[PDB]
């Protein structure tokens, strides 16, 4: 950023400065016959107000709420699941048979959305961004989606431009979430199981069948 | 690449209709004197807009050029009376004053322009916003904003402030707050137009559109270097004349050129001319477009 | 140059409440700026793939045309271009910044 | 390895009316004495053509070998304004001449020599345009150009500028032009015939013929150091010569070496002959070719 754009002032966003060339002359101003120049700084800003969290699932923990009671009165909520230890008042607790798991989730990906429910992709997770493909603009906090961040990755030349003399167009084709989102929102018709959100504590879960068949 | 950063076009005068005490050394302002109201504007690390277009005017020289009107009272004293006018809209901004420095200007908001005075002996802060008590005290004013000056006459009081989701800006009471308010000190973009209020901007669009006239071109005297000269002193087309002078195909293209029977040398400025802006849309040509770091108040919920 | 995708896009002209009538468009999931917000664009089921082995040419001024051949990346000699640059004065001035293959100039 | 930048073939003249100054040292032009109308064609990073072909007659030498003619007036006045040849030609000049010179002259349109001096005391500036005060003044003038003239009788007096794409260059009105021209100061190659005008160039060709002419060699004389002697006195195989002269197979091939009973040592100065140049694909000799810097004007629609 030399002094074209050097007043404008510092910003913690991801920016970028381009240089283009347009024609000089007397026809829009300029006194060397040589063609101007075409400075133009572009920085990204969310128009919206939510921010999404896509994260994935590699396997499903068969969780059990369990709320102990202790001696003196003081009850307590916790949960256990596989092989998990928690702490209570008394000592602790850990999970010893759990012959209950589903395999086969590295090809879905989740959206947690605070506030609304959830929702499911019918495709693997997204690691490297790529031009045309769901996980582009990504950043590591809600601020770095809201305020836009400059720490967030992105990929090089995102930002298309269609100068039009005196005129500027710079445009992207990013895809949006909510439409997914709002696509494929839970519940829905997967194999044989319902997905939904979770209560007490933020998550996904889902709802089987059978009885519960465990060691405590 | 032309180094003619102290030349001015027009007549040169930087001193303020309230702060006339500079004005034995800017008059006119040229490559020499020491003013204090232009020596700042071209120091590297200040104000890079002014910097990149110096080539123009300033808001002093449009104020006495009968561009940029001026408020009642033009320069509201600091050690009078108990209420003025001239604080509710510098609380509001925050800016970084070097010391030695007596008055500081800066835009109001009904368009004109409205200044501070401290009797002697006060002197100015790091901030701006108090004049305290105390090398020598400057005779001056110090640019609290990031503005140039042109001459233009586009007529545009139809407009007002053009930021969304912003509940009270400067001194401006837009629209109402019923939820969380921000007031973080951030750069907003602006544009005055003729008879008009302090209309903000969002979206800007600077362009160069040079043109043949008078005001665009700049000089230095020749004597067995820069020094100053007047340019009102050459021929026209075939005219008449005091002096002589020449130039190149743009100087000598609408005036008269004498090579080396001369006594000086007018060249075109890079980049003055005429500076529009667009604004809703719409190509506009301001008067005083520049940036301020004043109060912003963002509704966040 | 070339086209990878085609984006079916929707000249849209909005018109605003008070009466300013502005003229955008609309692709796939674009996005613009209009005075009362901004609009994007949904359900898009018309597309066509299969693109990346024609090349496109620009002429300002008169009109423009299609190669049957795919887009060509290296140059080399005796084949459709070999003399490159990067803007209308390296082509027009013959600007130095130019790409081009060495040896390409023959001597008698 | 360059060659002799002392000997001239031909008269060794280098002064011009009005500034007869250095006709003490200056007449001919030998390794003893200096002159600053001839010691700037040498300066390396300036005129390097000069510098390759040494073996060739400049401009004065050429005015004062009864080839090229003067112009009316010849030295031209840097105060008599509204009056005088050099005005639209030394407009679309742009040159550099050194400090402490007072005249300067350069090639015109009709193929004279149309010099510009300033009354005493007065001095030039850097560009060689302009004339300021001032340190002593030099008793020459200073080539603005960087071209050579040779001996040639080959007709061409009805051949103009040849340049293809270009409305008007320097001085000269080919065609005309009412669109956007350029205004780019480039440099061009400009050639004069025989009785012809300044025909400039877009690309030209420059060759070599070696000859065994009586100016092709020095002479050095033996003392027991080297001093200048005259050639022409040299034996002659079947015609004239007095003072006997030696030297290696070149100057005994054509002439008599006796070496202990000569008075001189001859050699064959390298880099000497007929230099012809390919105007337009044909093969010709004319009688100033060279560089300069001018006003070009191409048509741009």
């Not at chain 2, 604080?87 to 070097?98: R, S």
């Not at chain 2, 030695?100 to 802060?125: F, I, W």
């Amino acid at each position: 950023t030399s002094a074209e754009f050097s007043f404008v002032g510092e910003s913690t966003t991801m920016r970028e400065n381009k240089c283009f060339e347009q024609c000089g002359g007397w026809g829009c101003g300029c006194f060397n016959v040589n063609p101007s120049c075409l400075f133009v700084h572009t920085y990204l800003q969310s128009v919206r107000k939510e921010a999404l969290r896509v994260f994935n699932c590699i396997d499903w923990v068969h969780k059990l709420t369990l709320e102990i009671t202790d001696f003196d009165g003081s009850v307590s909520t916790i949960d256990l699941g596989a092989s998990s230890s928690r702490f209570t008042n008394w000592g602790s607790v850990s999970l010893s048979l759990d012959a209950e798991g589903i395999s086969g989730s590295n090809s879905f990906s989740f959206i947690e959305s605070p506030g609304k429910g959830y929702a499911i992709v019918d495709e693997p997770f997204s690691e490297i961004p790529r031009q045309g493909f769901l996980g582009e603009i990504r950043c590591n906090s809600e601020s770095s989606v809201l305020s836009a961040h400059e720490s967030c990755l992105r990929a090089p030349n995102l930002i298309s431009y269609k100068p039009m003399i005196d005129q500027l167009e710079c445009t992207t084709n990013l895809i949006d979430p909510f439409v997914v989102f709002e696509r494929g929102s839970l519940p829905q018709t997967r194999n044989d199981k319902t997905f939904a959100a979770s209560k007490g504590n933020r998550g996904v879960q889902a709802f089987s069948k059978g009885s519960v068949q465990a060691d405590l | 690449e032309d180094p003619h950063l102290r030349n001015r076009p027009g007549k040169g005068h930087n001193y303020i209709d309230g702060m006339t005490q500079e004005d034995a050394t800017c008059k006119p302002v040229t490559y020499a004197g020491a003013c204090s109201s232009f020596d700042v504007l071209l120091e590297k690390g200040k104000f890079p807009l002014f910097q990149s277009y110096a080539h123009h005017r300033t808001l002093l020289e449009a104020v006495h050029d009968t561009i940029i009107a001026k408020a009642d009272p033009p320069s509201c004293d600091l050690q009078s009376a108990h209420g003025n006018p001239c604080m509710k809209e510098k609380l509001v901004m925050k800016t970084h004053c070097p010391n030695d420095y007596q008055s500081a200007h800066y835009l109001n908001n009904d368009g004109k322009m409205a200044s501070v005075k401290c009797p002697p002996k006060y002197e100015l802060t790091e901030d701006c916003n108090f004049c305290r008590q105390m090398a020598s005290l400057k005779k001056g004013s110090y640019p609290l904003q990031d503005l140039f000056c042109q001459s233009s006459e586009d007529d545009g009081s139809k407009l007002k402030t053009k930021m969304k989701g912003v509940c009270e800006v400067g001194v401006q009471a837009l629209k109402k707050c019923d939820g969380q308010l921000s007031t973080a000190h951030e750069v907003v973009p602006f544009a005055v137009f003729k008879n008009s209020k302090k209309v903000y901007l969002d979206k800007l669009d600077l362009k160069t559109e040079e043109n043949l006239l008078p005001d665009s071109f700049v000089c230095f005297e020749h004597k067995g270097e820069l020094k100053s000269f007047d340019i009102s002193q050459c021929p026209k087309i075939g005219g008449h004349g005091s002096k002589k002078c020449t130039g190149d195909a743009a100087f000598c293209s609408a005036y008269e050129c004498t090579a080396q029977y001369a006594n000086a040398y007018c060249s075109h400025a890079n980049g003055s001319g005429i500076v529009q802006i667009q604004v809703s849309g719409v190509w506009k040509k301001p008067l005083c477009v520049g940036y301020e770091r004043v109060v912003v108040k963002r509704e966040l919920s």
